[PDB]
Amino acid sequence: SAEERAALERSKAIEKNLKEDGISAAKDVKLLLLGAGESGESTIVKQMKIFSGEDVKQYKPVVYSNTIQSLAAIVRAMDTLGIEYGDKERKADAKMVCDVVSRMEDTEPFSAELLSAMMRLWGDSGIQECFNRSREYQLNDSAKYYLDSLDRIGAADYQPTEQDILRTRVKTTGIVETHFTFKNLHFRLFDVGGQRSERKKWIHCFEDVTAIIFCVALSGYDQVLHEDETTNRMHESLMLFDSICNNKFFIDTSIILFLNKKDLFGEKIKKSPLTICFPEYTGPNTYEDAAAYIQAQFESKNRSPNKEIYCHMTCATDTNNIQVVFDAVTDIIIANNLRGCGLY
Amino acid sequence: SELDQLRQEAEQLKNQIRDARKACADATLSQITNNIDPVGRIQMRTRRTLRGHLAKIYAMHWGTDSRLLVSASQDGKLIIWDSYTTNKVHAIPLRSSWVMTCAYAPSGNYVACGGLDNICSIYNLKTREGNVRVSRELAGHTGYLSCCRFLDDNQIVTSSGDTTCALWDIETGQQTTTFTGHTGDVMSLSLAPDTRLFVSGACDASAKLWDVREGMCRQTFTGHESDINAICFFPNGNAFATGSDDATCRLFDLRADQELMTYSHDNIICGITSVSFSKSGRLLLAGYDDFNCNVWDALKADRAGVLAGHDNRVSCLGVTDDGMAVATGSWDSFLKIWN
Amino acid sequence: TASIAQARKLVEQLKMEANIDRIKVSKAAADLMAYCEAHAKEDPLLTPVPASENPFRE
Amino acid sequence: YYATLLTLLIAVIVFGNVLVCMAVSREKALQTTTNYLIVSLAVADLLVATLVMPWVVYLEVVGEWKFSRIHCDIFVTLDVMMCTASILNLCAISIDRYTAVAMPMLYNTRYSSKRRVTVMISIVWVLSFTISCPLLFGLNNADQNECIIANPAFVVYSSIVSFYVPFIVTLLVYIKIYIVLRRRRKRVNRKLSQQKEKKATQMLAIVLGVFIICWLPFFITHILNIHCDCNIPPVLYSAFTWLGYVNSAVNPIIYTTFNIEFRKAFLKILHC
């Protein structure tokens, strides 16, 4: 039938787009970033990210829909709090905004009528009072900013952003994806900082990650927080490292280990050099030997013949971070390809 | 002082609940069903294979017409399939590829998904353009979304890795009710046939029966030792079943406030990832980590048959409303329709 | 004193659940069976549907 | 009448190669470009052992080809086609390993991976057909019960295209892969990782050595026996011809017994 042929044409178009996307998506490198504290995670991310307009250009319709949904929330605040508009006609305009939101039309092109009514609503002292009473009814202050500038959001039709906050996504928390390129490789680094939840449940989703980047701090050799119940950062870092190293989903996934804060470590070891975390350590009270012992403590956790740990010492002011990851990734991929052939 | 008095009172109340349980737990389904015939051997075969995902499939759900199937995978594409022809109907790109749950609205107008980004995204499938766009984003969770299920077009129930569930108003985009009382991450939700009650399973292994309108936990059930990964309701709404990492499935009755039956086998050392019931409730299906799905006789605690066409862990199961077909999905990127 | 507020919430939840009425397990099991038996003839997975009727076999 | 002593060679060639085919066909871990090329190699060896070797035995039993002329033309054509396909599969394996090291991002994918395997296998069988095709008519010039390839028009062409070009291809590529592995080994610089490189610097030599020793003396003789009067008795020519099939018996082990996934597949197949 003609109807089935039309369905087949739609299906073929879907399959074609899915295949083209899969083709481009596969040409990449995936890196998972882990640590057992604040560590050097933020340092390594800032260093790796040497896209800036990418999100700005892409979220215009998001800021727009947040602006309208918030304005409807303000109208709800208006009726909940008992704050009236000076011009009672604006209440009808307030209803229009709520209907736009309740109709799920707040992402649609913004008409002249919507701009006229919303600008009339925004200039009323009762809307500013609704924000003044935002402590009773919860309102979005960023949307307040965009509403003050609503004339531009509407009249211009499109503008990448009016704020450099990047929507903040403070609540987004969760997984933070950092995209970058270096030489001829693209990378996606997954900074999983917001998952204050059980790792067993979410770790499997990264089973196919090309490599794991693990950041620890050398200065943590004697750094004990009250939250750590007398245990120092070095031991928490080693326990997490061992847990991930022998995880059933990462048996063959290589680890790139960064030992950060080498300057603070080298200065701190003048007093009590590595005695506090590793009381059994015996050797010169020097930067090189203490660092070698710590690295050995991390190296000893690799129990798989098909896995290796790359180690590099860093400093916040040490910019040689992107080449180290690039080279480690190259060697990881080569090793995996060599095992495919079985040479090696 | 006050803390010790309250802890002792809590222990006394738990003991009273346990004794109240013993007052009724003087029978079991495994004995009363000795008077009925077994279902016999079930030999289901695949009738359709659905290809298209390039990554592990994490979620699947059947619509109310028994024809349109929705699935989601690590590719970041939510795909709506015509289960009779294998024709694809929709492919919805996601803003975040870390998707773990999806649902299909009973009206056929909306779909939902979410995952590790802590945002529940509601999509409108019935548009004038013919394209599918995000209709709403539900923000406010502080952990990953483990299950999303629609009650109606304007109301959705979410569950997250933040020890809580919530009832969301889709049109407003805000939480209206929250469900607290869990201590571990919550893994799954199942809604009652009448939409008024729902259940949740938790890492602490205490599944709970929640009152949607009251906003509180009405009943707490225990029995598993490890995390509960899947939960579903018995078709008549008076019973539910859970699957856990203990390679065990358990059937509970809400009015008895009891565990009725334990499903286990000596050769099952893999956990349960999905649980579902047939239209009559006679069959219980569960997906396992050994790349198959066992079909249990829900009234016998035995094995009715096995579906074993997958090359990786089974991630999702579903049964049509009329019982005509069973769908499976796994980490091998394929979906299968069994009959 | 957060642990006290938490203990109070736990005590109130247990006091509520302790007063829920209950039925015998044998009755719940009998009702469960009655449902399954009443609709057993209607369930395509227990009573296979012929290809002329089954939309996946036709 | 002692040709039957070659029966075990046929039995060995088929046995090892069927295990390879089953190792892939019964397993999903072994689903790589190298495993597909290895299976193609195993197929070429199974076909030479099944379609050609029994007639090599028949001809050795009775030196007179007491069979039809068409049957011989077919036999000769298949002998050349299958030996050429085996050599070209060795070339395809070597070049795939080169891609794996020289351009690691192209190897570790799925779309270009399937395209490269399809092209390499197709070109191997297309060339083996093209090269053996002239033996189906005319040039064979068989006489009475003797139907042995000895036409310079075909012998020189075939020897160059079926062996010397494929020969020079693998050795430079394998040596280059070694140069890359050695130069990286000397920079990466715990004993096992160097040892793992060492096994590679030994396994590559094995692949090259067995190829060189099995096929080289045949093709030199193959050309020399027609080029000029020389001391090449039929026993030497036949011994080198048989060595050419010994290579087919050898391939399944050097290609599959070093790979742990193949070892596991074999243990499953063999109930071991």
Ligand SMILES: NCCc1ccc(O)c(O)c1
């Ligand atoms: N019998 C060994 C196979 C063979 C024979 C003749 C040839 O020209 C050739 O290239 C290969």
